[PDB]
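Consortium newsletter contribution from the modelling node. Members have asked for a concrete example of what our holo predictions look like. Here is one, prepared for the chloride ion complex that several groups have been discussing at recent meetings.
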Amino acid sequence: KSMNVRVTTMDAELEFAIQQTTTGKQLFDQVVKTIGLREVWFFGLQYTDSKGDLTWIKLYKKVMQQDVKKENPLQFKFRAKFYPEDVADELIQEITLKLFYLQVKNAILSDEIYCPPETSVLLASYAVQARHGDHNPAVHGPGFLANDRLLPQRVTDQHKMSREEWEQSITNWWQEHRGMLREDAMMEYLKIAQDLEMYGVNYFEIRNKKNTELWLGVDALGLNIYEKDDKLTPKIGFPWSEIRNISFNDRKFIIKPIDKKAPDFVFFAPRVRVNKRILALCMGNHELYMRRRKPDTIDVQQMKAQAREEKLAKQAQREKLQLEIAARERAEKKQQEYQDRLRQMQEEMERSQANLLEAQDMVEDARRKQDEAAAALLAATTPQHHHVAERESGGGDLARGPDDLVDPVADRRTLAERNERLHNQLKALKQDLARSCDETKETAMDKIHRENVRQGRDKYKTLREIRKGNTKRRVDQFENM
Ligand SMILES: [Cl-]
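And here is the predicted structure:
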């Protein structure tokens, strides 16, 4: 029996059928080949299992053996499970950029990630650039932005500004981005967002042996420990380069340091299913961290060169464009293109399966057709080595990195401290918004953030601090929390 599925990306919906023998990898590959995405290591398919839990599809298991919630169609979300370390250096393709951008903007707008008011407004201004192109006062008037999702509810809740006033303020900043390509606006949005404390962090409720309630943060840079009442500023950290082995047994998680002299980092999670998720995220983030410590592979450098050329091809084609296409129409056209590509894939796959069987049944002419057919079928698949390795108990040894491994956090700085223009924008915005701020509407997170700023703290400065001393010192500090 065949099963209907729907896969939702941040920019599209894909509808097609699978069979009982279809694997997670074949499902995934149908998706990424349709949308033209090759940076497959960041992404996965989420679904809801029969118990109501958010689960990620396993590639080397049949989809129909994975307990996907029974409904017609089966429902999947195509999402980034792993984040880049640094967006500007790592996101190669336009489709990969776009999808990260939309995912991260959604996290900001939904208040999944804390983002202060002044930064929320600047980000809103880049989002309007990304979505609508250059501001033009002769063309963009009352009602143009009426249906755009501009800001987190926290920000609008705590200021005494009307929608019209917000639109005007964001439009003033949008005017500053004129000439910027939509793709560059998306990249700039991500460059600003990636320095937010909560960006890219998977948070898990844990406890130490003395039973103190904590958060574990798993991200691209390492593992962080937070006090229960402060998700912005972790207290203890380990970079991925210090971890040797990770495993769990029931509720007990054990992290073995590379430092043979150091004790184990041990904690407890309230449920074994969450431990499996933690383990998968640790193993994947560690794996990608180690790729980043090594030179680009043959495949990545080629992706990068090709991306760089398609950017020029695209720009040459846009310079012949007589009329601007509005955002809604662009989105519809993109959806249509995907639908066209999915049908083409399905047709070519049927024909190639057929041509393969015509040749197999039927020699120098027949062998060539068999090869062309087989090549076409494999071109519908992604290279297995591009993907991240797949997993009561579980875990094991992590592949150690290069001998000259240098962790990047020591030399990493925020954009705001490196870029005077950004600094001065945020400063101007902070002054502007204070005129309408309602102080009785400060949230707990707002207070933590304002104190961080008052104390001169930032994301990487804090990471350097909490990673000081040898492993044993930090493991001991954890046990005493
Ligand atoms: Cl392969």
